[PDB]
């Protein structure tokens, strides 16, 4: 499996409206999330590619750390990281051992589903989707194969939040983690 | 109104384990085949997007050209090549016509699926071929499919077919009434 980490913006589905942006700080009373939420892509449940492993309130927002543990997806992204020419045209430039940066290229953002500010039970969050159609602000999404070396790739985690982070990704094991459930995006139609 | 184009990967039992490419050769018997196929994508059921219009032997390979005809699929390939990000980022900047651009970036490969090679040395029963898929994967033989509003701009992007060859080919395309055609099972998604 991939570790995944990064800011995530926090998203609700509205009736009639698309898309309602919240402010983190609209939600922090609810962090720490260490119940492990399903990892999807772009908010199409079916699409489950793994578990976060925690949501940390830290310094302006709330971090995430993921694991993408479905084989299904993760043969499909090599798959597609190796051999497409459309997932690699928009990469300069690729290494070989391309997984990385085709993730972080086309599922740049981290989404975190949370019910509306209007609400009380239910959980307050449902998921954090990768996602690719979301905004050029407030998430940055980096997979790596250790959490250490993608916590490494944040400038505003401070030393004992990220510390923190660590710590709790070392309790995880990977193996005690759920088959998630997955099938390809355009299986779905 | 799509008019595609191409050279084909012929396949049996395509995206199973059983999965073998066939050698052209090995189906060059069974050809032309001018009645329609489901065109698909992906080899997934249910994404019919339109029907083949002739299958050919020609010099340097198989070539079909097909109709693309769902209203859905054309219409929700058309607001996404205007409109979305992820659909431009992998196209040049700028291109006139997003969504032939977009279809030909997208959508290179055509998949000829076919009956297993055990079926074919000993005179095939039914029917050799199922149908044809646009693929965003598994292209080999199989060059980049060509979209476009007019059937003989699109036969005559590829120099590999001749004069005669084409003729042949549209001999058959414009002899197809687009609309007579049963509209394909694909729904879209939005
Ligand atoms: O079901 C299939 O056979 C199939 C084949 C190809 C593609 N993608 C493509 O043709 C394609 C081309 C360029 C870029 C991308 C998206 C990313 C590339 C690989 C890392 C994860 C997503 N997909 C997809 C969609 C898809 C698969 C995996 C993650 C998301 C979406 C499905
Ligand atoms: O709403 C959804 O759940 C969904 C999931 C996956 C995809 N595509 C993909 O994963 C994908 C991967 C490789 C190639 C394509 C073909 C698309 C054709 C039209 C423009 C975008 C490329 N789609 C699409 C777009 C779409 C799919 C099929 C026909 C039209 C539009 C929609
Ligand atoms: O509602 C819209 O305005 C809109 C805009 C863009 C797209 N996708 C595309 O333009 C598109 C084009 C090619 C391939 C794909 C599927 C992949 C999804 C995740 C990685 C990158 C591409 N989508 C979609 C379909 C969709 C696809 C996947 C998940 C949800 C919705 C809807």
Redesign the interface.
């Known amino acids: 499996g991939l570790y995944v980490g990064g800011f995530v913006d926090v998203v609700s589905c509205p009736k009639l409206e698309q898309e309602l942006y919240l402010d983190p700080d609209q939600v922090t009373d609810y962090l720490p999330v260490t119940e492990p939420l399903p990892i999807t892509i772009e908010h199409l449940p079916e699409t489950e590619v793994g578990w976060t492993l925690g949501l940390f309130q830290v310094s302006h927002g709330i971090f995430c750390t993921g694991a993408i543990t479905s084989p299904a997806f993760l043969e499909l992204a090599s798959?597609?990281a190796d051999?497409?020419?459309?997932?690699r045209?928009?990469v300069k430039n690729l290494p070989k051992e391309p997984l990385l940066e085709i993730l972080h290229t086309?599922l740049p953002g981290l989404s975190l589903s949370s019910i509306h500010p209007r609400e009380p039970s239910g959980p307050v969050f449902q998921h954090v989707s990768l996602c690719?159609?979301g905004r050029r602000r407030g998430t940055v999404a980096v997979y790596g194969h250790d959490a250490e070396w993608v916590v490494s790739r944040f400038s505003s985690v401070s030393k004992s939040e990220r510390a923190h982070i660590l710590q709790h990704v070392s309790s995880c094991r990977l193996e005690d983690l759920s088959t998630p459930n997955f099938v390809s995006p355009?299986?779905?139609?």
């Open positions: 798959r597609l051999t497409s020419h459309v997932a045209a928009p086309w690719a159609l355009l299986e779905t139609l």
